[PDB]
C-alpha cells in the first residue's frame, strides 16, 4: 500500500499519542530528521523536500474528493470555497452568492480560476485525522486549505501568510517561487500581507517545480507565489499552524496581570506620579532638556524591568493551554483506545439493551485516553478539567467544554495527567477515601477521557 496508508496503519499500532504525533511528523518531512528541522529550519529557512515518490500522499486528498464534497456536502462560496484569478498583475475573486455546486465550481475552473477550499478537515475524515495527530506535536492548532489550479494559470498574487506553512503536492505540477523576508519588520510577520506585484519582490531564494509527493515548507513572512504551466493542473494541500503563538502574544497576557500583582504587593508601584509630570512629559515636551524627564524615563524603565518578578507565567500558560484545547480538533482514536474506552463498551440494542451495567472498580487499571485531550486549570477559586473530546471538526463550533475537579481529587487528577501512558490502579489514587477514587475514575471514564487496561465487564 501507499506510504500514507502504511504510516496510518502504523500509528494505529502505537501506544502513546505523543509518540504517534512524533512519528507522523517524522513521516511528513522524511527523510529529513525532525530534530534537525526544528533546530535549524523551523522559522528560519524555506525547505523543499523532494520525496521522489508520487504515491507518498495517496489517500490523503484528491480532486475526486473535492468533487464529492461540493456535491454531497454544503460547501458555501465565500466561507468554504474561494475562486481566485491572477491576471495582469492583479488579484480578483469571483465568488457567486450561495452554495458551491459542482456545475458552478467547475465552470470557474474551466474559466481559468483557481479554487481554494478552506478547512477540509471539517468534511474529509482523512485530513482531519492527519491534522488531529499533528496538532499534538505542534503544541498549536493545525489548519489546512486545499488549492486547485487549472493548467496554464495563476490564482493568487504574491503574498506571505501569518503562519508556518507546509505545502503538500497532491496532484499535477506547479511552479513555486519563495522569497526571503524583504525587511526586518516582515520577518516572522504577525499578520498576513496584501497582494503584491512582481516589482515589490526581489530574487527568489527558492524556485522549483513541485511534483506529487513533494513538500515545501516556509516560515510566516516569506513571500511566495506559484503558477501552473505546460498544460497541466495542480492540487496541493497547505498545512499551517503557529498563528499568533509568539512570545509577544504571551507577554500581551502576562503584563496586564503583572502590573496588577505588583501594584498589590509592592508600594513602589502604588506611589503617586509627579504633580507636574505633564509639564515635561508629552509629545510637545520631547526635546525638553528637563533633567526630570530623563529621571521619569529612567524610573519607568526600572519599574518595567521589575515586573518580571511578578509575572504569573504559569497562569497564562494554562490559559493558552485552555485556548489550544478549545481550538483543538477532536481526537482520532486507535482501535485499541476505542475498545478500552466508553466509546467501545459493547452496550448496544438487540427489544432490550444488551451488555449493560459494566462499572469501574478499585482494582481497575486506568490512564488517560490520550495526552493532548485535557488540561487542568484554575480559574478563580476552583479547578477545572478542560477537554477536547466533545469538540467539533468545525473550528469553535462548540463552546469550551470542562468539568469541575474537587480538591479531594486534584492530586489524583494531576497524577493521571502526568503519568500517561502508565496504567494506574484506581485503588491507588492520591484521594482521601475510596469513594473519591471511584467517583473521579467513573466520572472521567464516562466522559470518554479515560481508558482501562482490560475492557469493563459486568
Amino acid at each position: 500500500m501507499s506510504p500514507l496508508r502504511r504510516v496510518l496503519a502504523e500509528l494505529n499500532r502505537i501506544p502513546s499519542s505523543r509518540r504517534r504525533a512524533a512519528r507522523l511528523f517524522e513521516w511528513l518531512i522524511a527523510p529529513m530528521p525532525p530534530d534537525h528541522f526544528y533546530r535549524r529550519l523551523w522559522e528560519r529557512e524555506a525547505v523543499l523536500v523532494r520525496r521522489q515518490d508520487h504515491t507518498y500522499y495517496q489517500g490523503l486528498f484528491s480532486t475526486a474528493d473535492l468533487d464529492s464534497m461540493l456535491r454531497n456536502e454544503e460547501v458555501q462560496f465565500g466561507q468554504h470555497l474561494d475562486a481566485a484569478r491572477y491576471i495582469n498583475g492583479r488579484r480578483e475573486t469571483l465568488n457567486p452568492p450561495g452554495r458551491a455546486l459542482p456545475a458552478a465550481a467547475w465552470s470557474l475552473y474551466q474559466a481559468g480560476c483557481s479554487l481554494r477550499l478552506c478547512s477540509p478537515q471539517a468534511f474529509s475524515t482523512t485530513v482531519w485525522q492527519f491534522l488531529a495527530v499533528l496538532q499534538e506535536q505542534f503544541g498549536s492548532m493545525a489548519g489546512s486549505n486545499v488549492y486547485l489550479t487549472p493548467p496554464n494559470s495563476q490564482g493568487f498574487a504574491p503574498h506571505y501568510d501569518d503562519i508556518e506553512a507546509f505545502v503538500l503536492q497532491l496532484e499535477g505540477r506547479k511552479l513555486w517561487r519563495v522569497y526571503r523576508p524583504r525587511a526586518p519588520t516582515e520577518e516572522l510577520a504577525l499578520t498576513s500581507s496584501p497582494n503584491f506585484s512582481q516589482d515589490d519582490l526581489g530574487e527568489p531564494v527558492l524556485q522549483t517545480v513541485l511534483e506529487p509527493g513533494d513538500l515545501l515548507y516556509f516560515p510566516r513572512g516569506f513571500i511566495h507565489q506559484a503558477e501552473c504551466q505546460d498544460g497541466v493542473h495542480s492540487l496541493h494541500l497547505t498545512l499551517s499552524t503557529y498563528q499568533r503563538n509568539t512570545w509577544g502574544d504571551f507577554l500581551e497576557a502576562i503584563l496586564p496581570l503583572a502590573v496588577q500583582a505588583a501594584m498589590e504587593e509592592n508600594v513602589e508601584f502604588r506611589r503617586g506620579l509627579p504633580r507636574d509630570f505633564m509639564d515635561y512629559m508629552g509629545a510637545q515636551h520631547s526635546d525638553s532638556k528637563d533633567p526630570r524627564r530623563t529621571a521619569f524615563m529612567e524610573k519607568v524603565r526600572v519599574l518595567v524591568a521589575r515586573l518580571g518578578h511578578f509575572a504569573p507565567v504559569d497562569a497564562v500558560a494554562d490559559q493558552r493551554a485552555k485556548d489550544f484545547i478549545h481550538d483543538s480538533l477532536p481526537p482520532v482514536l486507535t482501535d485499541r483506545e476505542r475498545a478500552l474506552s466508553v466509546y467501545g463498551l459493547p452496550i448496544r440494542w438487540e427489544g432490550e439493551p444488551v451488555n449493560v451495567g459494566a462499572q469501574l472498580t478499585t482494582e481497575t487499571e486506568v490512564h488517560m485516553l490520550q495526552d493532548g485531550i485535557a488540561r487542568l486549570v484554575g480559574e478563580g477559586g476552583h479547578l477545572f478539567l478542560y477537554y477536547t473530546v466533545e469538540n467539533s471538526r468545525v473550528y469553535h463550533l462548540e463552546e469550551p467544554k470542562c468539568l469541575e475537579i474537587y480538591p479531594q481529587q486534584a492530586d489524583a487528577m494531576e497524577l493521571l495527567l502526568g503519568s500517561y501512558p502508565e496504567f494506574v490502579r484506581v485503588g491507588d489514587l492520591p484521594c482521601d477515601s475510596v469513594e473519591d477514587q471511584l467517583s473521579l475514575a467513573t466520572t472521567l471514564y464516562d466522559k470518554g477521557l479515560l481508558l482501562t487496561k482490560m475492557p469493563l465487564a459486568l
Partner: peptide, 10 residues
C-alpha cells in the same frame, strides 16, 4: 481577494 485562511471566518 484573501489568502490562506488558517481559520475560515466569513
Amino acid at each position: 481577494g484573501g489568502n490562506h485562511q488558517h481559520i475560515c471566518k466569513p
